[PDB]
Amino acid sequence: EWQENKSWNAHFTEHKSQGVVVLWNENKQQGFTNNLKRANQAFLAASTFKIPNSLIALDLGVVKDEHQVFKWDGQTRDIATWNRDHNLITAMKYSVVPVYQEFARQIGEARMSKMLHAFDYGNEDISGNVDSFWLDGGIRISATEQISFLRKLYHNKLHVSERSQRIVKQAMLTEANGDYIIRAKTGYSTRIEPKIGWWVGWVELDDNVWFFAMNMDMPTSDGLGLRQAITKEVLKQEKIIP
Amino acid sequence: EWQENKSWNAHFTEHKSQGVVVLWNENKQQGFTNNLKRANQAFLAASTFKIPNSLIALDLGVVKDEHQVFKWDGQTRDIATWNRDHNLITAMKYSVVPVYQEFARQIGEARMSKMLHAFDYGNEDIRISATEQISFLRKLYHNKLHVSERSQRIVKQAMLTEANGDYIIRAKTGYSTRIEPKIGWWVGWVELDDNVWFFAMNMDMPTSDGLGLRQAITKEVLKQEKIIP
Ligand SMILES: *C(=O)[C@@H](NC(=O)/C(=N\OC(C)(C)C(=O)O)c1csc(N)n1)[C@@H]1NC(C(=O)O)=C(C[n+]2ccccc2)CS1
Ligand SMILES: [Cl-]
Ligand SMILES: [Cl-]
Ligand SMILES: [Cl-]
Ligand SMILES: [Cl-]
Numbered sequence: 001e002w003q004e005n006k007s008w009n010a011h012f013t014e015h016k017s018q019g020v021v022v023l024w025n026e027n028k029q030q031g032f033t034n035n036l037k038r039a040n041q042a043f044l045a046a047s048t049f050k051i052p053n054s055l056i057a058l059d060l061g062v063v064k065d066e067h068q069v070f071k072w073d074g075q076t077r078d079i080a081t082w083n084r085d086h087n088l089i090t091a092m093k094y095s096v097v098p099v100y101q102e103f104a105r106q107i108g109e110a111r112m113s114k115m116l117h118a119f120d121y122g123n124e125d126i127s128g129n130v131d132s133f134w135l136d137g138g139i140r141i142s143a144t145e146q147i148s149f150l151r152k153l154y155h156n157k158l159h160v161s162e163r164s165q166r167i168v169k170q171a172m173l174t175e176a177n178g179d180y181i182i183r184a185k186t187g188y189s190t191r192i193e194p195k196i197g198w199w200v201g202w203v204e205l206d207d208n209v210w211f212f213a214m215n216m217d218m219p220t221s222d223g224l225g226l227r228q229a230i231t232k233e234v235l236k237q238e239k240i241i242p
Numbered sequence: 243e244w245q246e247n248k249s250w251n252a253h254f255t256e257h258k259s260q261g262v263v264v265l266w267n268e269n270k271q272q273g274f275t276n277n278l279k280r281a282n283q284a285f286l287a288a289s290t291f292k293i294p295n296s297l298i299a300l301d302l303g304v305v306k307d308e309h310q311v312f313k314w315d316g317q318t319r320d321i322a323t324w325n326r327d328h329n330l331i332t333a334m335k336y337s338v339v340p341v342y343q344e345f346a347r348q349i350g351e352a353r354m355s356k357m358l359h360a361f362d363y364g365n366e367d368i369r370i371s372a373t374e375q376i377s378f379l380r381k382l383y384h385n386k387l388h389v390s391e392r393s394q395r396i397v398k399q400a401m402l403t404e405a406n407g408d409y410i411i412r413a414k415t416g417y418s419t420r421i422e423p424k425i426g427w428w429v430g431w432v433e434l435d436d437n438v439w440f441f442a443m444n445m446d447m448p449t450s451d452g453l454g455l456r457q458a459i460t461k462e463v464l465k466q467e468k469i470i471p
Contacts, residue, residue, distance in 0.1 A: 090435050093407070166395055176405035178335075206332050 001031065008034035011233040012216070015226050019196070019216025021234045022143040026151070026209040031144070032238070042122060042140035043215060046187035047095040048198045049134035051153070054088060054168045056115045057103040059160035063088055066167050070099045092171040095186060101131040118159040121149055136191040146200040146213035154202065154209065172201060180205055180241050186227060188218065195219055199227040203240060210240050243272065244373075250276035253462040254445070257455050261445025263463050264372040266380070268438045273376070274467075284369035285444055288416035289337040290427045291368060293382070296334065296397045298357045299345040301389035305330055308396050312341045334400040337415060360388045372442035375429045379440050383431060401430060409434055409470050415456060417447060424448055428456040432469060439469050 012018055012034070020038040024031045033039040057063040066088040076083050081094040091099040104112065109130050116124045122145050128137025141149075152158050156165045172183040184201025197218040202211040214231050218224070235241045254261050254276070262280035266273045275281045299305040308330040318325050323336040333341040346354060355367075363378060364370035370378075381387050385394045401412040413430025426447035431440040443460050447453065464470045 093435075163391070163395075166392075166399075170395075170399070173402075173405050173410060176402050176410075181402065181405075204331075206335075 001029075002036055002039075003030065003032050004034070004036055005032055006034055008234050008237065011230045011237070015223070015230065017216055017223060017226055017230070019214060019230070020143055021214040021231060022147060022212065023234065023238065023240075024147050024151070024211040026211065027207075031147070033143070039143045042142040042145065043194070043196055043198075044136075044189040044192060045122065045134050045139055045141045046189035046196075046198055047097070047134075048141075048146065048185050048187040048200050049139065050092055050095065050100055051168060051172065051185050051200075052116065052119055052121055052149070053100050053103055053107075053134075054092065054171060055119075055153070055158060055160050055164050056107055056112065058088075058164040058167055060107060060111065062103050062106045066171060070102065073098065088167070088171050092185065095188075097135075104131040115160075119149060119152075121145075135189070143200075143213035143215060146198075147211045150200065150202060150211055150213070154211070174201065184212075187215075188221070188224065190218070190221075197224060197227040199231055203235060205240070210235070244278060244281075245272070245274045246276070246278050247274050248276055250463050250466070253459050253466070257452070257459060259445055259452060259455055259459070261443060261459065262372055263441065263443040263460055264376060265463070265467065265469075266376050266440040268380070268383075268440065269436075273373070275372075276463075280444075281372045281442075284364065284371045284374070285423075285425045285427075286418045286421065287364060287368050287370050288418040288425075288427060289339070290370075290375065290414050290416040290429050292334055292337065292342055293397060293401070293414055293429075294358060294361055294363055294378070295342055295345055295349075296330065296400060297361075297382075297387065297389050297393050298349055298354060300330075300396055301357075301393040302349060302353060304345050304348040308400060312344070315340065330396070330400050334414070357389075372429075372444060375427075375442040376440045379429060379431060379442075383438065383440070403430065413441075416444075417450075417453065419447075419450075426453060426456045428460055432464060434469070439464070 008021055020033055020035045022033045022039045069085050069087055071085050072083055082096050086096050086099050113126045122139060122141025125138035126133050133139055153165055156162050158165055169183055172185055174184045175182040181204040187198030189196050195218045196215045198215045200213040202209055212231055262277045264275045264281045311327050311329055313327050324338050328338050328341055382394055385391050398412055401414060403413045404411040410433040413428055416427025418425055424447050425444045427444045429442045431438050441460060
């Protein structure tokens with residue numbers, strides 16, 4: 001069912017890095033990874049938690065639609081793009097943490113936890129600050145656990161409205177051309193060791209969907225582009241994209 | 243409300259071509275075009291019709307959703323990408339006429355004519371102008387058409403054409419050669435962080451080798467107006 005392809009490691013070593021890529025061929029229900037053990041190692045979800053946090057917020061009406069504006073609170077923050085108004089689309093594109101902490105507080109522990117148990121999401125543990133548990137709280141999720149969650153999202157199978165799932169898959173739009181469509185969220189876990197980078201989503205082809213989840217050691221923010229670059233080297237190595 | 247910017251004509255004649263491009267800045271609610279007369283001329287919609295058709299099919303049930311598989315009837319047509327199975331996403335992409343022909347049969351004239359008239363589409367008794375395309379497209383963007391929100395969302399999904407960290411383009415191509423003038427279309431919009439530019443262009447397409455120019459000339463104009471890099 002799974003299959004180890006350690007060749008992929010050359011892409012991590014080329015860039016002097018370490019991590020795991022996990023691929024899943026929907027048509028052939030076959031997974032692939034350079035490291036089956038690390039594929040199942042659970043880390044903080046960091047901003048990949050913005051997928052489930054969007055779904056819940058939309059489904060509870062915290063977010064009415066992807067046009068609703070969330071005004072900047074006027075607190076200038078190290079991340080220049082955080083210091084403006086945002087709707088769901090730009091908030092996900094630019095991982096606007098404070099916008100989603102506010103979603104989190106309006107959701108509340110109770111519903112947050114109930115929903116993560118409905119979603120089957122990683123270790124389902126929200127314990128910590130309701131508005132930071134995904135950065136420095138209890139929640140743990142592995143790459144293969146990201147793929148099970150995303151596959152459900154992709155078939156409108158989560159226990160929230162079809163519309164909610166449709167609007168979140170829209171906000172995940174990352175890349176589209178005439179060979180593929182990538183829908184995906186980045187993560188950068190940096191408050192608790194180990195420092196890692198996430199990239200989770202999937203690539204849509206004419207006649208298949210390839211779901212991916214990768215994470216990798218991220219000591220300094222200089223390697224943040226490697227998250228996507230190494231994934232695509234794998235996808236390009238496996239002929240999923242040209 | 244409509245400014246003529248004849249400067250754009252150079253993007254047409256550098257490619258030894260004649261046409262119109264129509265832009266609509268949505269924030270400011272102002273449009274701009276290289277040719278005001280040609281922007282209100284109605285040409286054959288050709289495949290740009292696949293948009294209202296997709297909506298009606300969806301909102302009626304001919305199409306359950308964008309995953310449903312429309313199997314090839316085994317008849318080999320000259321466009322190779324038609325000679326296979328397709329879903330809404332790939333039938334819009336490849337402009338698979340015989341798939342859409344079938345949608346329309348199952349929709350049937352009566353229902354089709356009633357809805358086309360509810361969208362106030364092309365003619366009220368198909369030809370439509372570049373500026374009528376924009377106006378239809380703006381309602382689609384805001385989910386203001388008289389079909390379900392779901393209908394409208396799935397069609398915008400199926401209109402996805404290009405996306406990066408500078409813009410998203412949702413659009414549909416069109417090409418007709420039965421009748422003069424032979425015209426290509428490209429209609430849709432480009433989404434920015436805090437604005438959305440609708441576009442509609444058409445151009446004399448006297449052969450076919452210049453089909454890429456529908457997209458190329460449109461981007462040269464978006465590039466000029468600083469809307470995209
Ligand atoms: C879209 O507009 C479709 N156009 C047609 O199918 C053509 N004619 O339709 C008639 C009946 C004439 C009409 O008025 O609608 C047609 C295609 S080629 C030719 N000599 N007549 C599809 N047009 C698109 C497109 O937007 O360009 C096609 C994409 N394509 C083009 C060239 C080669 C392969 C694929 C296919 S048809
Ligand atoms: Cl979050
Ligand atoms: Cl909803
Ligand atoms: Cl989309
Ligand atoms: Cl379909």
